[PDB]
Paper text:
Transthyretin (TTR) is a transporter protein that binds to retinol-binding protein and thyroxine (T4) in human plasma. TTR is also known to be involved in human amyloidosis. TTR is a homotetrameric protein and has two funnel-shaped T4-binding sites that are located at the dimer-dimer interface. Several small molecules bind to the T4-binding sites, stabilize the TTR tetramer and inhibit TTR amyloid fibril formation.
To gain additional insight, we also determined the V30M-α-M and V30M-2 complex structures at 1.4 and 1.9 Å resolution, respectively. The EC50 value of α-M was 15 μM, indicating that methylation of the 7-hydroxyl group reduced the inhibitory potency. The rmsd value of the xanthone skeletal structure (18 atoms) was 0.36 Å, indicating that the binding positions and directions of γ-M and α-M were almost identical. Although the mangostins were found at the T4-binding sites, just as in the known TTR stabilizers, the direction of their binding mode was distinctive. However, one of the chloride ions (CL-1) was replaced with a water molecule in the α-M complex structure. Whereas γ-M can donate a hydrogen atom in the hydrogen bond with the chloride ion, α-M cannot donate a hydrogen because of its 6-OCH3 group, and thus the chloride ion could not stably bind to position 1. In the case of α-M, the flexible dimethylallyl group could be adjusted to the shape of the V121 side chain to increase the contact area. The superposed structures clearly showed that α-M interacted with V121 over the whole dimethylallyl group, but only a few atoms were involved in the interaction in the V30M-2 complex.
Residue numbers in the entry:
A (entry chain A), C (entry chain A): 10 to 125
B (entry chain B), D (entry chain B): 10 to 124
The structure:
Amino acid sequence: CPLMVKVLDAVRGSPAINVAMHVFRKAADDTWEPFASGKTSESGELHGLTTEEEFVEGIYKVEIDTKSYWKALGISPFHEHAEVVFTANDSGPRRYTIAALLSPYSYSTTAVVTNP
Amino acid sequence: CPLMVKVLDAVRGSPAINVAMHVFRKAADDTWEPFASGKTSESGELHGLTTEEEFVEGIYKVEIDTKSYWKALGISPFHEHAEVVFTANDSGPRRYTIAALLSPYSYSTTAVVTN
Amino acid sequence: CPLMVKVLDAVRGSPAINVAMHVFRKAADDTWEPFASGKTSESGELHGLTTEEEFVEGIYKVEIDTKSYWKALGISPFHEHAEVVFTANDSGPRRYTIAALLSPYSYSTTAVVTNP
Amino acid sequence: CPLMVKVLDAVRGSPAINVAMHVFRKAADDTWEPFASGKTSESGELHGLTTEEEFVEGIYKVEIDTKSYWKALGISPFHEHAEVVFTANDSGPRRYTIAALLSPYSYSTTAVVTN
Ligand SMILES: COc1c(O)cc2oc3cc(O)c(CC=C(C)C)c(O)c3c(=O)c2c1CC=C(C)C
Ligand SMILES: COc1c(O)cc2oc3cc(O)c(CC=C(C)C)c(O)c3c(=O)c2c1CC=C(C)C
Ligand SMILES: [Ca+2]
Ligand SMILES: [Ca+2]
Ligand SMILES: [Cl-]
Ligand SMILES: [Cl-]
């Protein structure tokens, strides 16, 4: 699959399991159209969001529901969510791994982009 | 000022200067009402965005135009922008410092909340 | 293997390939004894540093030669190296993945610790 | 002061206060000669470590006792400490601000180098 998200927890030193996220694609009219959604597995990964043929050029947003993750562990975190917005496939098809590292008052996000 | 934003550049080891951002508050209809903006100073800081009276409880978004910053440096970036979305003042007024550390394919953001 | 290191490059959005690192273990006399070494593969990972039986309880240091990585790309970075020092297996055997995300003037490091 | 260290806590969203650290310079025999130390203030900052005259070229290490900080909060940490090792002043004297963002199983460190 050309899009994978991995989420880690910096407090427990573990994958962040069962984290929900929704992916949107910017439409011709400039609205955010729903594109895919899912939750992280026991390895903190979410695979199978899309296919090479469906994942056309465009601007995509991944909104990761980090607040519900922390609240289920008892913590009231700073962020409502962690958002990643990016233009994809502008130079032809690529594979994207987006990683998010979570703490109650901080997050980091990174992308590794590879040419298939 | 109960809201300050500081932006750092991890490629050059410097404050990220002249970075534009806009601040929004979530409206009753779930849309984002812009209410403040500015660009970072030579210290990488943006002060004076709001006042204690105006900065009431609500959900706020800071959208930092990281892509324009990297374009200005001739460096290809991954993200369109860096967004920070948070509920403010849920226990009473707080002073917020939001810091963002930028790289072309990564960013970090952190909040320091003081009383 | 119970110890794996992954290194990513935040400037290029890629694994950090051919990054050298050395692992040390603190001896009874408080010196750092060489333990293992290696370089990252094309996926930015270094596997096979040790075995469950050899990786006894102790304090371990991983020194990742990030300066030579950046210098080979033309960049004079801030850090001489990225070091990770930790006590391992204090509560019984665990598997450790240590991730390092590199920029010229910043690095982050994280550990995921799992119970085999 | 050409060297300042600032430490932030990503769990509590606060400066990391009373964090101890030691600064070393690499000696001719490849050993680490300690020469300064201190603990962070209520702002998470440690100033006054050295002077412009004393802070000559060399390789310097800052060892931050992150484990003691997390132990004081009752939180199990991964790292023994956070080390920052760098060559200073290789092009002339610079002012260095080293920032460290702490979580129990992760840290980040960044340098802002100003002239
Ligand atoms: C990139 O790591 C840094 C950095 O280099 C500088 C930083 O500067 C800060 C300055 C601040 O005033 C405050 C508020 C502290 C009060 C007591 C109100 C900060 O939180 C920071 C920083 O966090 C800071 C950081 C860490 C930020 C990251 C790694 C996203
Ligand atoms: C820089 O953000 C990333 C990233 O881009 C890729 C990452 O890849 C990882 C792969 C891993 O196998 C593991 C172990 C997970 C298990 C369930 C054993 C990882 O922790 C990561 C990553 O942490 C990772 C990260 C985050 C690391 C940082 C921000 C220093
Ligand atoms: Ca949400
Ligand atoms: Ca070295
Ligand atoms: Cl990856
Ligand atoms: Cl700074």
